[PDB]
Design an enzyme around this catalytic site. Structure first.
Site, short mmCIF file in Angstrom:
data_model
loop_
_atom_site.label_atom_id
_atom_site.label_comp_id
_atom_site.label_asym_id
_atom_site.label_seq_id
_atom_site.Cartn_x
_atom_site.Cartn_y
_atom_site.Cartn_z
N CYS A 190 -8.00 9.39 -13.22
CA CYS A 190 -7.72 8.47 -14.10
C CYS A 190 -8.35 7.10 -13.98
O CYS A 190 -8.28 6.23 -14.47
CB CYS A 190 -5.99 8.05 -13.48
N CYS B 155 -5.30 13.24 -5.99
CA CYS B 155 -5.75 14.32 -6.85
C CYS B 155 -6.85 15.18 -6.36
O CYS B 155 -6.72 16.24 -6.36
CB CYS B 155 -6.02 13.85 -8.28
N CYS C 112 7.03 -0.57 10.49
CA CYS C 112 7.35 -1.29 9.46
C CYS C 112 8.05 -2.58 9.93
O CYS C 112 8.86 -2.57 10.87
CB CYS C 112 8.32 -0.66 8.68
N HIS D 217 6.68 3.84 8.71
CA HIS D 217 7.98 3.47 9.15
C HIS D 217 8.04 2.85 10.59
O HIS D 217 8.80 1.94 10.95
CB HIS D 217 8.92 4.67 9.03
N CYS E 95 -1.02 0.83 5.64
CA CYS E 95 -0.66 -0.18 4.64
C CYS E 95 0.16 -1.40 5.18
O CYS E 95 -0.05 -2.39 4.69
CB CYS E 95 0.18 0.39 3.74
N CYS F 29 7.89 2.18 -0.63
CA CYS F 29 6.69 3.24 -0.68
C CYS F 29 7.08 4.43 -1.30
O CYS F 29 8.16 4.90 -1.04
CB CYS F 29 6.31 3.48 1.12
N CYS G 80 16.71 -3.28 4.86
CA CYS G 80 15.65 -1.96 4.81
C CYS G 80 15.77 -1.49 3.19
O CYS G 80 16.50 -1.58 2.65
CB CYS G 80 15.97 -1.08 5.81
N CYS H 30 3.35 -2.20 -0.69
CA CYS H 30 4.25 -1.65 -1.72
C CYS H 30 5.90 -1.69 -0.96
O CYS H 30 7.05 -1.77 -1.96
CB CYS H 30 3.99 -0.11 -1.53
N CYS I 197 -9.13 5.52 -8.76
CA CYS I 197 -10.01 5.62 -7.40
C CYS I 197 -11.28 4.70 -7.47
O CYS I 197 -11.65 4.26 -6.50
CB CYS I 197 -9.99 7.17 -7.03
N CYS J 58 -2.97 7.19 -3.81
CA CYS J 58 -2.82 7.24 -5.50
C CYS J 58 -2.79 5.74 -5.96
O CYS J 58 -1.69 5.36 -6.41
CB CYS J 58 -1.80 8.12 -6.05
N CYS K 227 12.68 4.26 -0.13
CA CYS K 227 11.33 4.21 0.64
C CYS K 227 11.18 5.50 1.16
O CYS K 227 11.96 6.02 1.88
CB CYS K 227 11.50 3.00 1.58
N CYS L 118 2.15 7.97 -1.20
CA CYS L 118 1.16 8.59 -2.20
C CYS L 118 -0.18 9.08 -1.68
O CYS L 118 -0.77 9.66 -2.20
CB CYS L 118 0.61 7.21 -3.02
S1 SF4 Z 1 11.60 -0.06 4.60
FE1 SF4 Z 1 10.92 1.83 4.65
S2 SF4 Z 1 9.33 1.98 5.97
FE2 SF4 Z 1 10.55 0.13 6.32
S3 SF4 Z 1 11.90 0.72 7.85
FE3 SF4 Z 1 13.17 0.92 5.97
S4 SF4 Z 1 12.57 3.07 5.37
FE4 SF4 Z 1 11.08 2.25 7.13
S1 SF4 Z 2 -5.62 9.79 -6.94
FE1 SF4 Z 2 -4.27 8.59 -8.29
S2 SF4 Z 2 -5.52 6.78 -8.76
FE2 SF4 Z 2 -7.02 8.45 -7.83
S3 SF4 Z 2 -7.70 9.49 -9.75
FE3 SF4 Z 2 -5.69 10.50 -9.09
S4 SF4 Z 2 -3.88 9.59 -10.23
FE4 SF4 Z 2 -5.93 8.29 -10.29
S1 SF4 Z 3 2.95 4.04 -1.80
FE1 SF4 Z 3 3.10 3.90 0.53
S2 SF4 Z 3 1.14 5.02 1.40
FE2 SF4 Z 3 0.75 4.62 -0.83
S3 SF4 Z 3 -0.27 2.72 -0.73
FE3 SF4 Z 3 2.24 2.03 -1.02
S4 SF4 Z 3 2.87 1.73 1.07
FE4 SF4 Z 3 0.61 2.73 1.25
#
Ligand code: SF4
Ligand code: SF4
Ligand code: SF4
Ligand code: FCO
Ligand SMILES: [Fe+2]
Ligand code: NI
Ligand SMILES: [S]
Lengths: 283, 482
Positions: free
Chosen positions: A18, A121, A211, A208, A247, A265, A232, A259, A21, A159, A238, A268
């Protein structure tokens, strides 16, 4: 780096990508993308940003590939579709012959120093390989293995990935190679990959367990609306418990958000993304 | 001279996979075919899922314009779910998405297009290139282009910080969902958005808009080609109140010299020249089908052929600016006078021929970037720190909805039908689908195919104007095919 330093050649091939990246890499804070391009690597082929075009661009890549046989880095963005004799991804034409992504990876893959599968991907198949797809979208490592191509692969998933994971993996590799040469250096990189091919510096810690809302999870205090930032996010979907990425520390886009703070989250960076992380918005 | 047929695959400095094939006779393009060569099939991948997942999955159509797909998807879901987005959430969504208009237009002009006119430094990826690249700028102005390309790398990154402040991250925002926006803007984060916005504003006003007119003034011949059908579409975008009737860009169609209303029931997608099953031709998106047929004889693209009441239309900044006819920026008015001898006050004062041209599309995009600054400034005054931005609606068992917006490259709609609480159908009609499509079932060319007709190729060994024309439309083939 310097404008006149050693910079290895890189070809960046897009399959079923897409361009996210590539765009995430453009967001690198330090080094900036200008510094990466002018001082760290020599990006010899990249369809989104390079000057030349068409068969001339393909032939330029082929000339560099011959000069640097065994020594260039190959970045793959997107999956590789095998159905219909490769026809779901045509990446170029030269000599009146179309070149599918299948063809391109069979051509350049054997001759790369290493293949960097950037994004979920390329690393794992990702959304193009998910339920309801019909193109035979295949991850880089599987495609290469199925075709007997033994070139080392490093997965840098997400992603998109965070730019620091992409640049940081390049820096890890180039440092190892400076210390040990190419084969010794790549062996040192492989030693720090997890079972999913990911560099443990960026992917060795669970979201987690690190977190800021973990106390709320343990107390059972769950937000019932996305905009409640005290509780949470587990009941909102999540996937932090199932996800290995940094992250929580690094955050995103110059540290301005991430995220879990903003929403949830979605897991990804994980090999089962998206289907094993879906539905996204309930536990 | 006689005929030469030229194939360009890949067309570079666009998003995604495109082949262009042109027939040149006596120094001019006389025919063209555009091929989108990569398919993923989001419309089938989406089936069977929880509908709420769509607003994440669809963003992966494109990492350049994911906020547009996020927006169309959440609008479709809002309609299908009967979700009533709070006023403050409407505004927050506009701040998330508007920031990516700035990013995308700056990326397009500098990082995709500017090398058409500017020689970069003597190292990859700026060399090698055509030996006769028709790079006309003085050493000083060329250096300004390079310096601004480099500065723009930081400016576009700052735009993505703006997106992420309330969007979570970018590419691929987390912060838009059915029911609104997931994060209430705080006073502190609004300060941070405004501080970044000021830097982007200064770059747009002082560097970007002036450089487009200035480079254009050295390429005045590029306002005389690329007209195509001179036909445009806008479906509306950026709602300005909660009625659904008032938008920053209002809808309309323009064709054969006439303004007309936009009625979405008149959209049909043809497939004769596309790699989809023949029995799916001619469907409106509410009944759309996506059945790949990669071996079908005669077809040459994975892009469907959308037609509006039979018309082949273009989309994007030119389309929106032409349909809406806003006042020109102060610096545009000044530079049109100083550098072109043109007195103009509103966009249509350029005239149809110069607006619908290769360079006119770059000018329209720069003008639109300036126009967006004022919209974002307004939203920063209108937003209320601390006020809720989301509702949490239950998933319906059976429903349908359509979301309409304008991606940076042009009109975008998503249609969703829900059955048994899951996606039954999901159809996407995107911007570069309108621009970069192949012939329809009657043989009428797509917008860019038609705009290529008449493009000059005075040197078949350096046929630079073919892809220059294509790049003026800012193609995104990931979007076009999905
Ligand atoms: S927000 Fe998501 S990563 Fe953070 S404590 Fe809750 S479930 Fe775990
Ligand atoms: S990993 Fe996600 S951001 Fe990267 S090419 Fe694939 S769809 Fe796009
Ligand atoms: S979806 Fe989860 S692993 Fe992916 S960038 Fe966001 S916090 Fe990080
Ligand atoms: N901008 C953008 Fe993407 C395209 N074409 C969409 O829709
Ligand atoms: Fe579609
Ligand atoms: Ni796009
Ligand atoms: S976007």
């Amino acid at each position: 780096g310097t404008l006149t330093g050693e910079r290895p050649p890189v070809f960046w091939l897009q399959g079923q990508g897409c361009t996210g990246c590539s765009v995430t890499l453009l967001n690198s804070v330090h080094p900036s993308i200008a510094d990466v391009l002018l001082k760290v690597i020599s990006l010899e082929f990249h369809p989104t940003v390079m000057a030349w075009e068409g068969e001339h661009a393909i032939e330029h890549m082929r000339k560099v590939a011959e000069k640097f046989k065994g020594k260039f880095f190959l970045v793959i963005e997107g999956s590789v579709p095998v159905e219909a004799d490769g026809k779901y991804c045509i990446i170029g034409e030269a000599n009146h012959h179309e070149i599918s992504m299948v063809d391109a990876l069979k051509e350049f893959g054997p001759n790369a120093a290493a293949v960097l599968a950037v994004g979920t991907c390329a690393a794992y198949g990702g959304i193009p390989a998910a339920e309801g797809s019909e193109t035979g979208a295949t991850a880089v490592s599987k495609f290469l293995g199925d075709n007997g191509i033994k070139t080392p692969v490093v997965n840098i998933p997400g992603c998109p990935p965070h730019p620091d994971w992409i640049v940081g993996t390049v820096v890890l590799a180039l440092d190892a190679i400076k210390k040990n040469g190419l084969e010794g250096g790549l062996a040192e990189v492989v030693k720090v990959l997890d079972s999913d091919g990911r560099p443990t510096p960026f992917f060795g810690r669970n979201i987690h367990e690190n977190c800021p809302y973990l106390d709320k999870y343990d107390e059972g205090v769950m937000s019932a609306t996305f905009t409640d930032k005290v509780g949470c996010r587990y009941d909102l979907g999540c996937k932090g418990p199932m996800t290995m990425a940094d992250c929580f520390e690094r955050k995103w886009n110059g540290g301005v958000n991430w995220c879990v703070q903003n929403a949830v989250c979605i897991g990804c960076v994980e090999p089962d993304f998206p289907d094993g992380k879906s539905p996204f918005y309930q536990a | 001279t006689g005929r030469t047929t030229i194939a360009i695959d890949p067309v570079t400095r666009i998003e995604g996979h495109l082949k262009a094939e042109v027939v040149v006779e006596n120094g001019k393009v006389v025919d063209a075919r555009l091929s989108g060569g990569m398919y993923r099939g989001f419309e089938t991948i989406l089936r069977g899922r929880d509908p709420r997942d769509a607003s994440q999955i669809v963003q992966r159509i494109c990492g350049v314009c994911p906020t547009a797909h996020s927006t169309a998807s959440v609008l479709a879901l809002d309609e299908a779910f009967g979700a009533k987005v709070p006023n403050n959430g409407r505004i927050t969504r506009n701040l998330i998405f508007g920031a990516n208009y700035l990013q995308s237009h700056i990326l397009h002009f500098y990082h995709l297009s500017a090398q058409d006119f500017v020689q970069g430094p003597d190292t990859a990826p700026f060399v090698p290139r055509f030996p006769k690249s028709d790079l006309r700028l003085s050493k000083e102005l060329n250096k300004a282009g390079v310096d601004q390309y480099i500065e723009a790398l930081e400016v576009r990154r700052i735009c993505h910080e703006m997106v992420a402040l309330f969007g979570g991250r970018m590419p691929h925002v987390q912060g838009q969902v059915v029911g609104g926006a997931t994060e209430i803007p705080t006073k502190e984060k609004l300060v941070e958005y405004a501080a970044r916005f000021k830097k982007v504003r200064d770059f747009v006003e002082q560097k970007y808009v002036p450089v487009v007119y200035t480079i254009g003034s050295k390429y005045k011949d590029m306002f005389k080609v690329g007209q195509g059908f001179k036909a445009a579409l806008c479906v509306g975008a950026f709602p300005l109140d909660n009625s659904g009737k008032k938008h920053l860009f209002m809808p309309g169609v323009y064709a054969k010299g006439k303004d007309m209303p936009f009625d979405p029931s008149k959209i049909k997608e043809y497939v004769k020249y596309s790699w989809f099953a023949e029995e799916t031709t001619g469907l409106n998106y509410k009944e759309g089908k996506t059945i790949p047929a990669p071996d079908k004889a005669g077809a040459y693209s994975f892009v469907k052929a959308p037609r509006y009441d039979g018309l082949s239309l273009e989309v994007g900044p030119l389309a929106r600016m032409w349909v809406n006819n806003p006042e020109l920026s102060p610096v545009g008015k000044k530079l049109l006078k100083d550098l072109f001898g043109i007195s103009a006050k509103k966009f249509r004062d350029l005239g149809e021929e110069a607006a619908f041209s290769l360079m006119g599309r770059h000018v329209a995009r720069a003008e639109e970037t300036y126009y967006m600054l004022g919209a974002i400034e307004g939203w920063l005054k209108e937003i209320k720190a601390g006020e809720d931005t989301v509702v949490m609606p239950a998933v319906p068992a059976s429903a349908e909805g359509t979301g309409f917006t304008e991606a940076p490259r042009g009109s975008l709609l998503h249609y969703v039908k829900v059955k048994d609480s899951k996606i039954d159908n999901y159809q996407i009609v995107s911007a570069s689908l309108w621009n970069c499509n192949p012939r329809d079932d009657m043989g009428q060319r797509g917008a860019v195919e038609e705009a290529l007709i008449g493009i000059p190729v005075d040197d078949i060994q350096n046929p630079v104007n073919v892809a220059r024309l294509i790049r003026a439309f800012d193609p995104x083939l990931g979007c076009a095919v999905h």
